[PDB]
Design a protein around this nucleic acid. Structure first.
Length: 69
DNA sequence: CGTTGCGGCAAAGTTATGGGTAAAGTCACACGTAGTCACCATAATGAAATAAGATCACTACTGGGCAGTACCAGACTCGAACTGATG
């Protein structure tokens, strides 16, 4: 249902978060990372939280901007 | 002890949504929208006609009475005559 709540822009943002975190999930972190460490750590923590209590961790990277306003 | 990664906290950053205000657009005023067959049931006469009714004319059948005739007496009336009392 969270996936059904996502937008193509939210999908692209989740894709960007996944591409940012993916080097940190393989033991080969990049030496040139513009995104600060706190956001990377939060994304990784939510990845693990989703893969623990949901079943798949990508679903923990969904923004769902539509509720805001 | 120092370093490194991780996580909480609270501004800060980004979208979104319902308000206000000047300013670029937008569009009608230019004589004009109402207007016209098609439609089939009901009243409604006026004519067409009725189906029975009304009367004429003829044919046949069957009740049935009127002007006139006729007899057998009974009964009242009266010519004609008889006969007795009388002044």
């Amino acid at each position: 249902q969270r996936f059904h709540q996502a937008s193509p822009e939210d999908q692209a943002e989740a894709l960007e978060r996944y591409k940012t975190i993916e080097p940190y999930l393989n033991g080969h972190p990049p030496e040139n990372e513009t995104i600060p460490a706190r956001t990377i750590r939060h994304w990784k923590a939510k990845y693990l939280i989703a893969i623990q209590k949901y079943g798949c961790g990508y679903i923990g990277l969904l923004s769902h901007r539509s509720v805001k306003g």
